[PDB]
């Protein structure tokens, strides 16, 4: 049993040990599954795939590796972090053999990047159940196609009863800029560039003129700038004050979505964009923000006080608001005949000179994702947050070997798991004179301490905690 | 005192020595500034920051380091150039102690990439005042927020009374393609690819048919091509002849802008695009061109002959026109019931297989900019022109040390500043038979010589000089 965090200089080493229980899935069978087997009639929801007797270990969320204090200690004192190494151990096998193999060639479908439940519990005293491994493949409706694949995980050599080197990724930037993209200027000095201040002398006929003025401290909106904010794909704006929302169903009809092969997937969470404008936190994008859930909440149709809605507002300096248009583009040629016109731009892709911040990571949220293997990508960093990797922590597949032919003995296994990660850090060099914003607990008394068990012994994490507190210059 | 230029092989070394004067700013105080202290009502122009007693040296414009005869000698003979080293000196101090320090860790805000006035003068016999340092931080209206920063520059160690290495950047491309993106084809040969020439036989009912044809010299617009022009964000079209322009005020209302945290900002200069179509020199994008003032031009509401409007028409080979749509897309599925529908693309983001030319640099324009420190960016080359750098030449701060408590002695300083940049060159290898276009003075007689003093001794620059004269193949 090893649980503790070694804080040494520019690096951290976190260790987590948990106890688990592994059942027998599908009565040791592989089974084809599709929406026909499920019962869904929708095309957007159609799927075809296979369920397996194997389980797998998912440590892909931060709260697995970090206590609430280790997270507080990380996010207040550091400008960046990223994983280096991993050491997965499995021991104290107890059966009532066991096969385990890691997929290091990435030859199976990779399901660890989809943000599924089944992680090691955040509180070390919990005992967790290993989730079942399954995967999907190509489909026409619920039917398959000649290009679909079938994977027998028995055909992989497994050990009957390791260490990993993370590939180089950029530091996750756990900080919030203390400047904004449009305000980078010296407030005291004029630019040498000119802009077109006026197009007509006065009221009347035939008044056209061109008057130019100097861009300066008095009018900052018209100054020349070297860089522009990142891309936008607009989301619908929902208010947490329900009387301010429209009296109609618009959750799916009004949502932003993308379409692939005729199937419409919701755009979730989507591009990295600020959740809301300054001063309005009662609004949140429809699919824009990662929505967690409070302990003991329930699966379907929970109220708003039963969820934790995360906000990205810290990136409103470099990133456009998710519920607002990107800007305006001139839509015609003016002339003596026609007035100049401009149109709202809802979505804007990459232009040269754009800068943006990625989505924040949370104690509860995912760590890494797997970059798909394709001829192209742009900025592979994943959209739910975390570190994108072509060859990420391998999947660790485990099952119970059957003991008897469909007649077998009802049997399960249990044991211990330890995973240890080394995290490289980036220290805060700031010369800021006045004190930083920090993540702190509130002194005011309460029935229960936060991030702690209650009188029934149920651990819970009260609010989502972002990584962005310290500041940098833009 | 060193001023000269050494032309050696593929390198150029340009030394410049200027005399300066440093007053006492803010009565040695750090004074809060916002739009309230100015009185600005408008929301787009709201700001919050601080003004400091410190000055700074801005050599960031090309005419600091290049004489007109050195600049001609550069742009006629060379395809590309870029800085290598920097050597700065401050000497012959005359105080009527003086503190100076470079910010080599970039721990202060960086105000040099904003194209402010206050550069080392273009003509060496001038004496220049040193501009005041100030910086903006986060705001809500005129109020600050907890995330705003305060920087005391006394909290930086300074010398009381350096060399620099430029980071690797691409050559600025001084040339204009002698081919166009859409004409790269062989004019004598047919392609082996077919296009759809005819969808009907003739006028009548139920005439639908499909006829395919070889693409070749006869019809060149339909041929298949491997690349496409750069991205576009449309600008309004203003005319220097004012009788085409509309008799309405469209300077702010009709301009392309981008919005960040609820505040709109004019898109200036914006993505690099050709200024006007071939044959039309009288049009210019509303906010898409750099506009310089002529010598002695006032600050407010000058006419169109007092300013020098640069144009990008060299890049019309690989780039779309700023005042035109990028192209058409289909907006519907045709059928017997539904006719073909197309829309004109006003803004187009990056697509795979695009090519473009960046914006040109001028004798009067900026050299480098600082890339904002962010999780991501695309094509960091700055939009006003020049060399984008993550570690640009550091800021150099200077002030008079106060001699006395609010009661001090009125005191100012002066001295000499010598700056030396080592520029790397790329020679013109072209096999073109006929002679190039060059930059020339005009032999025709005039009252004064261009780029020289008048009878009152006032140095002035007659026209903006672009860098692109020599040609290349596409």
């Amino acid at each position: 049993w090893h649980c503790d965090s070694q804080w040494l200089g520019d690096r951290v080493i976190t260790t987590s040990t948990r106890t688990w229980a592994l059942p027998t899935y599908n009565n040791h069978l592989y089974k084809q599954i599709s929406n026909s087997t499920s019962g869904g009639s929708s095309n957007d929801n159609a799927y075809f795939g296979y369920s397996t007797p194997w389980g797998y270990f998912d440590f892909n969320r931060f709260h697995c590796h970090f206590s609430p204090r280790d997270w507080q200690r990380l996010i207040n004192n550091n400008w960046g972090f990223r994983p280096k190494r991993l050491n997965f151990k499995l021991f104290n096998i107890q059966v009532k053999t066991v096969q385990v193999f890691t997929d290091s060639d990435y030859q199976l479908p990779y399901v660890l990047g989809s943000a599924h439940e089944g992680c090691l519990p955040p509180f070390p005293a919990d005992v967790f159940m290993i989730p079942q491994y399954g995967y999907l493949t190509l489909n026409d409706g619920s039917q398959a196609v000649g290009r679909s694949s079938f994977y027998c995980l028995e055909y992989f050599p497994s050990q009957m009863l390791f260490s990993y080197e993370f590939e180089n990724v950029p530091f996750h930037s756990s900080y919030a800029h203390s400047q904004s993209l449009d305000r980078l200027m010296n407030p005291l000095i004029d630019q040498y560039l000119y802009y077109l201040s006026k197009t007509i002398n006065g009221s009347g006929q035939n008044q056209q003129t061109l008057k130019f003025s100097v861009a300066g401290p008095s009018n900052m909106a018209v100054q020349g700038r070297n860089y522009i904010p990142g891309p936008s794909y607009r989301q619908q704006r929902v208010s947490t004050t329900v009387t301010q929302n429209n009296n109609s169903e618009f959750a799916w009809p009004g949502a932003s979505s993308w379409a692939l092969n005729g199937r419409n997937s919701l755009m979730n969470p989507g591009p990295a964009m600020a959740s809301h404008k300054e001063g309005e936190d009662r609004f949140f994008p429809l699919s824009g923000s990662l929505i967690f859930g409070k302990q003991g909440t329930g699966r379907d149709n929970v109220d708003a006080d039963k969820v934790m809605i995360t906000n990205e507002e810290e990136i409103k300096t470099t990133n456009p608001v998710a519920t607002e248009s990107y800007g305006q583009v001139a839509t015609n040629h003016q002339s003596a005949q026609a007035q100049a016109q401009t149109g709202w731009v809802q979505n804007q892709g990459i232009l040269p000179g754009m800068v943006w911040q990625d989505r924040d990571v949370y104690l509860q949220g995912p760590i890494w994702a797997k970059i798909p293997h394709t001829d192209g990508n742009f900025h592979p960093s994943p959209l739910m947050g975390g570190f994108g990797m072509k060859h990420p922590p391998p999947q660790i597949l485990i099952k119970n070997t059957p003991v008897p032919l469909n007649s077998f003995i009802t049997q399960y296994s249990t044991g211990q798991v330890s995973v240890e990660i080394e995290w490289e850090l980036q220290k805060e060099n700031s010369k800021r004179w006045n004190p930083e914003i920090q993540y702190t607990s509130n002194y005011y008394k309460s029935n229960n301490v936060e991030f702690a068990v209650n009188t029934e012994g149920v651990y819970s994490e009260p609010r989502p905690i972002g990584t962005r507190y310290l500041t940098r210059n833009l | 005192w060193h001023c000269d230029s050494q032309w050696l092989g593929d390198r150029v070394i340009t030394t410049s020595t200027r005399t300066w004067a440093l007053p006492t700013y803010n009565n040695h105080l750090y004074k809060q500034i916002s739009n309230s202290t100015s009185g600005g009502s408008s929301n787009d122009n709201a700001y919050f920051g601080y003004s400091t007693p410190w000055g700074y040296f801005d050599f960031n414009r090309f005419h600091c380091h290049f004489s007109p005869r050195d600049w001609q000698r550069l742009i006629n003979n060379n395809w590309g150039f870029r800085p290598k080293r920097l050597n700065f000196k401050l000497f012959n101090i005359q105080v009527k102690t003086v503190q100076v320090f470079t910010d080599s860790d970039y721990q202060l805000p960086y105000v040099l990439g904003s194209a402010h006035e206050g550069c080392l003068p273009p003509f060496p016999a001038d004496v220049f005042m040193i501009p005041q340092y100030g910086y903006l931080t986060l705001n809500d209206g005129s109020q600050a927020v907890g995330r705003s920063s305060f920087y005391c520059l006394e909290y930086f160690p300074s010398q009381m009374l350096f060399s620099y290495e430029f980071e690797n950047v691409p050559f600025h491309s001084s040339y204009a393609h002698s081919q166009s993106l859409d004409r790269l084809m062989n004019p004598l040969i047919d392609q082996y690819l077919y296009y759809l020439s005819k969808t009907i036989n003739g006028s009548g009912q139920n005439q639908q048919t499909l006829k395919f044809s070889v693409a070749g010299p006869s019809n060149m617009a339909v041929q298949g091509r491997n690349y496409i022009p750069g991205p576009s964000y449309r600008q309004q079209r203003v005319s220097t002849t004012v009788t085409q322009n509309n008799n309405s005020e469209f300077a702010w209302p009709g301009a392309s802008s981008w919005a960040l945290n609820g505040r709109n900002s004019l898109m200036n200069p914006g993505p690099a695009m050709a200024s006007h179509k071939e044959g039309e020199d009288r049009f210019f994008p509303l906010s898409g061109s750099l506009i310089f003032g002529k010598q002695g031009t006032g600050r407010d509401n000058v006419d169109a002959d007092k300013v020098m409007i640069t144009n990008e028409e060299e890049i019309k080979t690989t780039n779309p026109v700023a005042t035109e749509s990028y192209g058409q897309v289909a907006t519907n599925h045709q059928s017997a019931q539904a006719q073909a529908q197309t829309g004109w693309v006003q803004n187009q983001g990056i697509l795979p297989g695009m090519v473009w030319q960046d914006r040109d640099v001028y004798l009067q324009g900026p050299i480098w900019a600082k890339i904002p420190h962010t999780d991501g960016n695309f094509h960091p080359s700055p939009l006003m022109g020049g060399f984008g750098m993550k570690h640009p030449p550091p800021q150099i701060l200077i002030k008079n040390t106060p001699v006395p408590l609010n009661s001090f002695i009125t005191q100012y300083s002066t001295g000499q500043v010598s700056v030396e940049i080592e520029w790397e060159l790329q020679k013109e290898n072209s096999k073109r038979w006929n002679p190039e276009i060059q930059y020339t003075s005009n032999y025709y007689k005039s009252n004064n010589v261009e780029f020289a003093v008048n009878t009152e001794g006032v140095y002035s620059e007659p026209r903006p000089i672009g860098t692109r004269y020599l040609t290349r193949n596409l």
Partner: antibody
Amino acid sequence: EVQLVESGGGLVKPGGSLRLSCAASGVPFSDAWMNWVRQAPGKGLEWVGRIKSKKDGGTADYAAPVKGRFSISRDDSKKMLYLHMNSLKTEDTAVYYCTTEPSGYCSNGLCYTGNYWGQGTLVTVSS
Amino acid sequence: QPVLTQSSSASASLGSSVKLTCTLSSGHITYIIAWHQQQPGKAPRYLMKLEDSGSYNKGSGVPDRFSGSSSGADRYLTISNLQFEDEADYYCETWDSYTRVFGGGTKLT
């Protein structure tokens, strides 16, 4: 495919008032300027008025004959164009067409270069 | 306010090209104009709009035998192949920010 239907036409005494309505389809009504034109029987087209888009302001323009008698209204939510007629004249009787603005209409950074006439509605003002 | 003038009526025999003139007022010369045809019993059909330069944007549903061109302050419409199916009032319209103006119509036969 853009479709424009009109309604509200019929018989009204020379003194009186009537409303016409135009329900747009297949076009982004919020982003487009609309127009009313009328054609007296056996006579050529004659323009009535326009209604600018919300972004450009909801202001409306009117032809010199019908100025001050008629109003144009729009209901973005219901995607309908309205023409309110008051103080009629015998000469007013025309087929009233609902037409989109000839320059075009630009929605979400895409422009459309072509014009779509309505179906038409006959209005006979007589007693 | 612009003033659109055009011929009262003009006809042509089948299989031949007919040209139709629409004259802009002076000082409105540069304005862009659009052509509409109206069948004797039907709602008008947008044909195309032509600039002073001679560049024109043809409709989506329109045959290729329609085309137009312009001299100074003088606009044209050319029906290159005449099919019995199109003979109708051809209206010329022009627009300004303040108002929209129509021609008096040209009946083709």
